Scaffold this active site. Structure first.
Site, PDB file in Angstrom:
ATOM      1  N   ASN A 101       1.006  -1.048   0.120  1.00 41.09           N
ATOM      2  CA  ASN A 101       0.172   0.501   0.215  1.00 41.09           C
ATOM      3  C   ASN A 101       0.813   1.442  -0.190  1.00 41.09           C
ATOM      4  O   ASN A 101       1.737   1.099   0.637  1.00 41.09           O
ATOM      5  CB  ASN A 101      -1.178  -0.011   1.221  1.00 41.09           C
ATOM      6  CG  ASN A 101      -1.378  -1.253   1.052  1.00 41.09           C
ATOM      7  OD1 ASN A 101      -2.117  -2.234   0.065  1.00 41.09           O
ATOM      8  ND2 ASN A 101      -2.171  -1.445   2.414  1.00 41.09           N
ATOM      9  N   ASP A 103      -0.136   4.079   0.855  1.00 43.85           N
ATOM     10  CA  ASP A 103      -1.660   5.585   2.150  1.00 43.85           C
ATOM     11  C   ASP A 103      -0.684   5.529   2.791  1.00 43.85           C
ATOM     12  O   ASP A 103      -1.286   6.320   3.662  1.00 43.85           O
ATOM     13  CB  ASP A 103      -2.742   4.683   2.476  1.00 43.85           C
ATOM     14  CG  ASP A 103      -2.261   3.133   2.814  1.00 43.85           C
ATOM     15  OD1 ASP A 103      -3.624   2.287   2.599  1.00 43.85           O
ATOM     16  OD2 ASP A 103      -1.280   2.746   3.610  1.00 43.85           O
ATOM     17  N   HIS A 118       5.882  -0.459  -3.145  1.00 46.91           N
ATOM     18  CA  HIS A 118       5.139   0.177  -3.842  1.00 46.91           C
ATOM     19  C   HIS A 118       5.753   2.093  -3.680  1.00 46.91           C
ATOM     20  O   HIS A 118       5.393   2.836  -4.727  1.00 46.91           O
ATOM     21  CB  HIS A 118       4.396  -0.241  -4.360  1.00 46.91           C
ATOM     22  CG  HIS A 118       3.707  -1.391  -4.893  1.00 46.91           C
ATOM     23  ND1 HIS A 118       4.810  -2.285  -5.678  1.00 46.91           N
ATOM     24  CD2 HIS A 118       2.717  -2.357  -5.293  1.00 46.91           C
ATOM     25  CE1 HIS A 118       4.504  -3.022  -5.864  1.00 46.91           C
ATOM     26  NE2 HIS A 118       2.541  -3.188  -6.086  1.00 46.91           N
ATOM     27  N   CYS A 129      13.276  20.935 -11.355  1.00 39.52           N
ATOM     28  CA  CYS A 129      13.712  21.840 -10.363  1.00 39.52           C
ATOM     29  C   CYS A 129      14.387  21.244  -9.010  1.00 39.52           C
ATOM     30  O   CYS A 129      15.625  21.588  -8.335  1.00 39.52           O
ATOM     31  CB  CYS A 129      13.512  23.166  -9.724  1.00 39.52           C
ATOM     32  SG  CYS A 129      11.834  23.265  -8.553  1.00 39.52           S
ATOM     33  N   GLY A 191      -4.712  -8.764   4.063  1.00 41.95           N
ATOM     34  CA  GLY A 191      -5.390  -8.452   2.783  1.00 41.95           C
ATOM     35  C   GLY A 191      -4.527  -8.358   1.566  1.00 41.95           C
ATOM     36  O   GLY A 191      -4.216  -6.822   1.092  1.00 41.95           O
ATOM     37  N   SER A 193      -4.201 -10.489  -2.598  1.00 46.03           N
ATOM     38  CA  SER A 193      -4.117 -11.833  -2.922  1.00 46.03           C
ATOM     39  C   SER A 193      -3.511 -12.537  -3.214  1.00 46.03           C
ATOM     40  O   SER A 193      -3.262 -14.218  -3.747  1.00 46.03           O
ATOM     41  CB  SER A 193      -5.469 -11.438  -4.144  1.00 46.03           C
ATOM     42  OG  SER A 193      -4.464 -10.567  -5.311  1.00 46.03           O
ATOM     43  N   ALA A 218     -10.347 -12.038   3.133  1.00 46.12           N
ATOM     44  CA  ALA A 218     -11.265 -11.902   3.245  1.00 46.12           C
ATOM     45  C   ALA A 218     -11.387 -12.993   1.863  1.00 46.12           C
ATOM     46  O   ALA A 218     -13.190 -13.362   2.341  1.00 46.12           O
ATOM     47  CB  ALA A 218     -11.629 -10.504   2.059  1.00 46.12           C
ATOM     48  N   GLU A 219     -11.046 -13.802   0.908  1.00 48.44           N
ATOM     49  CA  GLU A 219     -11.067 -14.170   0.225  1.00 48.44           C
ATOM     50  C   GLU A 219      -9.417 -15.546   0.118  1.00 48.44           C
ATOM     51  O   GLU A 219      -8.487 -15.351   0.378  1.00 48.44           O
ATOM     52  CB  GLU A 219     -11.101 -13.979  -0.979  1.00 48.44           C
ATOM     53  CG  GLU A 219     -12.252 -13.000  -1.450  1.00 48.44           C
ATOM     54  CD  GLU A 219     -12.326 -12.533  -2.418  1.00 48.44           C
ATOM     55  OE1 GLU A 219     -11.752 -12.494  -3.428  1.00 48.44           O
ATOM     56  OE2 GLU A 219     -14.122 -12.728  -3.091  1.00 48.44           O
ATOM     57  N   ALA A 235     -10.043  -7.949   8.265  1.00 52.31           N
ATOM     58  CA  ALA A 235      -8.860  -7.621   9.300  1.00 52.31           C
ATOM     59  C   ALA A 235      -9.087  -6.847  10.343  1.00 52.31           C
ATOM     60  O   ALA A 235      -8.954  -7.431  11.493  1.00 52.31           O
ATOM     61  CB  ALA A 235      -8.056  -7.163   7.551  1.00 52.31           C
TER      62      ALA A 235
HETATM   63  N1  LIG Z   1      -2.970  -8.374 -13.462  1.00 49.38           N
HETATM   64  C1  LIG Z   1      -3.879  -9.022 -12.183  1.00 49.38           C
HETATM   65  O1  LIG Z   1      -4.354 -10.429 -12.574  1.00 49.38           O
HETATM   66  C2  LIG Z   1      -3.655  -8.813 -10.499  1.00 49.38           C
HETATM   67  C3  LIG Z   1      -4.836  -9.563 -10.554  1.00 49.38           C
HETATM   68  C4  LIG Z   1      -4.674  -9.205  -8.871  1.00 49.38           C
HETATM   69  C5  LIG Z   1      -3.759  -8.338  -8.215  1.00 49.38           C
HETATM   70  N2  LIG Z   1      -2.627  -7.658  -8.791  1.00 49.38           N
HETATM   71  C6  LIG Z   1      -1.806  -6.191  -8.892  1.00 49.38           C
HETATM   72  O2  LIG Z   1      -1.647  -6.855  -7.249  1.00 49.38           O
HETATM   73  C7  LIG Z   1      -1.253  -5.911  -6.380  1.00 49.38           C
HETATM   74  C8  LIG Z   1      -1.720  -5.425  -5.686  1.00 49.38           C
HETATM   75  O3  LIG Z   1      -1.750  -6.431  -4.816  1.00 49.38           O
HETATM   76  P1  LIG Z   1      -2.810  -6.817  -3.306  1.00 49.38           P
HETATM   77  O4  LIG Z   1      -3.082  -8.181  -2.688  1.00 49.38           O
HETATM   78  O5  LIG Z   1      -2.381  -5.633  -2.093  1.00 49.38           O
HETATM   79  O6  LIG Z   1      -4.369  -6.530  -3.727  1.00 49.38           O
HETATM   80  P2  LIG Z   1      -5.539  -6.747  -4.157  1.00 49.38           P
HETATM   81  O7  LIG Z   1      -6.508  -6.225  -4.562  1.00 49.38           O
HETATM   82  O8  LIG Z   1      -5.173  -7.641  -4.746  1.00 49.38           O
HETATM   83  O9  LIG Z   1      -5.960  -7.776  -2.365  1.00 49.38           O
HETATM   84  C9  LIG Z   1      -6.768  -7.489  -1.773  1.00 49.38           C
HETATM   85  C10 LIG Z   1      -6.702  -8.780  -0.807  1.00 49.38           C
HETATM   86  O10 LIG Z   1      -7.963  -8.599   0.236  1.00 49.38           O
HETATM   87  C11 LIG Z   1      -8.846  -8.845   0.402  1.00 49.38           C
HETATM   88  N3  LIG Z   1      -9.624  -8.226   1.274  1.00 49.38           N
HETATM   89  C12 LIG Z   1     -10.830  -7.412   0.662  1.00 49.38           C
HETATM   90  N4  LIG Z   1     -11.261  -6.594   1.673  1.00 49.38           N
HETATM   91  C13 LIG Z   1     -11.002  -7.477   3.390  1.00 49.38           C
HETATM   92  C14 LIG Z   1     -10.778  -6.714   4.441  1.00 49.38           C
HETATM   93  N5  LIG Z   1     -11.889  -5.857   5.098  1.00 49.38           N
HETATM   94  N6  LIG Z   1      -9.909  -7.781   5.054  1.00 49.38           N
HETATM   95  C15 LIG Z   1      -9.104  -8.385   5.057  1.00 49.38           C
HETATM   96  N7  LIG Z   1      -8.859  -8.963   3.403  1.00 49.38           N
HETATM   97  C16 LIG Z   1      -9.618  -8.129   2.963  1.00 49.38           C
HETATM   98  C17 LIG Z   1      -9.854  -9.255  -0.962  1.00 49.38           C
HETATM   99  O11 LIG Z   1     -10.634 -10.631  -0.830  1.00 49.38           O
HETATM  100  C18 LIG Z   1      -8.607  -9.779  -1.752  1.00 49.38           C
HETATM  101  O12 LIG Z   1      -7.476 -10.350  -2.070  1.00 49.38           O
HETATM  102  C19 LIG Z   1      -1.429  -3.849  -7.602  1.00 49.38           C
HETATM  103  O13 LIG Z   1      -0.366  -3.881  -8.534  1.00 49.38           O
HETATM  104  C20 LIG Z   1      -2.144  -5.262  -8.505  1.00 49.38           C
HETATM  105  O14 LIG Z   1      -2.264  -4.231 -10.219  1.00 49.38           O
HETATM  106  C21 LIG Z   1      -3.255  -8.657 -10.746  1.00 49.38           C
HETATM  107  N1  LIG Z   2      -4.347   1.012   0.175  1.00 44.70           N
HETATM  108  C1  LIG Z   2      -3.323   1.242  -0.534  1.00 44.70           C
HETATM  109  O1  LIG Z   2      -2.837   2.011  -0.602  1.00 44.70           O
HETATM  110  C2  LIG Z   2      -3.852   1.255  -2.670  1.00 44.70           C
HETATM  111  C3  LIG Z   2      -3.475   2.009  -3.657  1.00 44.70           C
HETATM  112  C4  LIG Z   2      -4.060   1.493  -4.923  1.00 44.70           C
HETATM  113  C5  LIG Z   2      -4.808   0.320  -5.113  1.00 44.70           C
HETATM  114  N2  LIG Z   2      -5.367   0.647  -3.863  1.00 44.70           N
HETATM  115  C6  LIG Z   2      -5.444   0.429  -2.691  1.00 44.70           C
HETATM  116 ZN   LIG Z   3      10.309  23.064  -9.845  1.00 42.91          ZN
END
Ligand SMILES: NC(=O)c1ccc[n+]([C@@H]2O[C@H](COP(=O)([O-])OP(=O)(O)OC[C@H]3O[C@@H](n4cnc5c(N)ncnc54)[C@H](O)[C@@H]3O)[C@@H](O)[C@H]2O)c1
Ligand SMILES: NC(=O)c1cccnc1
Ligand SMILES: [Zn+2]
Ligand SMILES: [Zn+2]
Length: 252
Positions: A101, A103, A118, A129, A191, A193, A218-219, A235
């Site tokens: 994240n 954030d 990231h 500048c 949190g 995937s 969550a999944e 979470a």
């Molecule tokens: N191109 C693709 O097929 C693909 C697919 C998934 C992720 N990504 C990449 O992965 C990076 C991000 O991955 P990430 O894992 O941070 O994000 P993500 O969005 O892939 O995964 C977040 C996970 O959090 C879970 N979640 C949702 N709400 C929740 C809650 N309240 N408590 C606990 N878990 C919860 C979801 O079920 C999900 O599996 C990015 O760069 C993205 O582009 C790419």
């Molecule tokens: N939690 C995060 O920083 C974030 C950044 C980009 C997309 N989704 C979530």
């Molecule tokens: Zn400048």
């Protein structure tokens, strides 16, 4: 009590060097939407022009206007999950947090060691500048729909310190995270995937090193099989339960 939360606490309560990896899911309960429907996202905007360093140098506005349209919560604050993880660090169990994240909710929650794979929204740099700014100097204008602009040279190329398409992952931080996965005694995912490197690989690296694996998502994910304990739920709800049980086991 549910056997999953108890065992997770049983594991943490016994580890003196645990590491937490977190993804967008740990900030959902803070008001920040996850990466859901990323496929569609790229059907509206050309990723190359709005989210790559190349497209940014070619036209900064695309990136910023793209961000304005998608960025929802700009003043989100850490939720119970972030605090639970900070409390774990104060207790001497969690030694590091690795997150994807940008954030900064872990630092604002009190975590002292956060490896940001990231990058983050903390600071921005003018590419012309070299003036640097804190996100706070632009936030308000941005929320009003104003594209950030250098106040010193007036350039529109004020790039935030986040990884964009076309640029490398911060090697030294990535290096520290991998080392972290290799010497920790407990590795917990919250949190994420776990689909793309490095998120997809760190769990396997810690698993090979002998760490106890815990996941709260969550999944389910394709990496679930290697985890000793796996919990399905939110979470913000599960994490504080685990911490309470750890404190109870400690004071007993
Ligand atoms: N191109 C693709 O097929 C693909 C697919 C998934 C992720 N990504 C990449 O992965 C990076 C991000 O991955 P990430 O894992 O941070 O994000 P993500 O969005 O892939 O995964 C977040 C996970 O959090 C879970 N979640 C949702 N709400 C929740 C809650 N309240 N408590 C606990 N878990 C919860 C979801 O079920 C999900 O599996 C990015 O760069 C993205 O582009 C790419
Ligand atoms: N939690 C995060 O920083 C974030 C950044 C980009 C997309 N989704 C979530
Ligand atoms: Zn400048
Ligand atoms: Zn360590």
């Amino acid at each position: 009590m549910e056997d999953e939360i108890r065992k997770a606490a049983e594991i943490l309560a016994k580890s003196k060097h645990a590491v937490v990896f977190t993804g967008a899911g740990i900030s959902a309960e803070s008001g920040i939407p996850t990466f859901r429907g990323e496929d569609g996202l790229w059907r509206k905007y050309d990723p190359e022009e709005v989210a790559s360093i190349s497209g940014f140098k070619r036209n900064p506005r695309a990136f910023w206007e793209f961000s304005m349209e998608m960025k929802d919560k700009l003043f989100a604050e850490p939720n119970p999950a972030h605090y639970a993880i900070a409390e774990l660090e104060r207790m001497g169990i969690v030694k590091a947090v690795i997150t994807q994240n940008i954030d900064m909710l872990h630092q604002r929650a009190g975590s002292r060691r956060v490896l940001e794979l990231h990058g983050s929204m903390d600071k921005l740099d003018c590419l012309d500048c070299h003036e640097t700014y804190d996100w706070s100097e632009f936030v308000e204008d941005f929320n009003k729909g104003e594209i950030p602009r250098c106040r010193k040279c007036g350039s529109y190329y004020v790039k935030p310190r986040v990884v964009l398409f076309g640029e490398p992952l911060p090697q030294r931080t990535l290096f520290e995270a991998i080392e972290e996965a290799k010497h920790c005694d407990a590795f917990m995912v919250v949190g994420s995937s776990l689909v793309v490197y490095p998120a997809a690989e760190l769990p396997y690296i810690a698993k090979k090193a002998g760490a106890k694996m815990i996941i709260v998502n969550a999944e389910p994910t394709m990496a679930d099989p290697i985890f000793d304990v796996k919990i399905i739920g939110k979470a913000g709800e599960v994490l504080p339960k685990i911490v309470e049980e750890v404190k109870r086991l400690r004071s007993e």
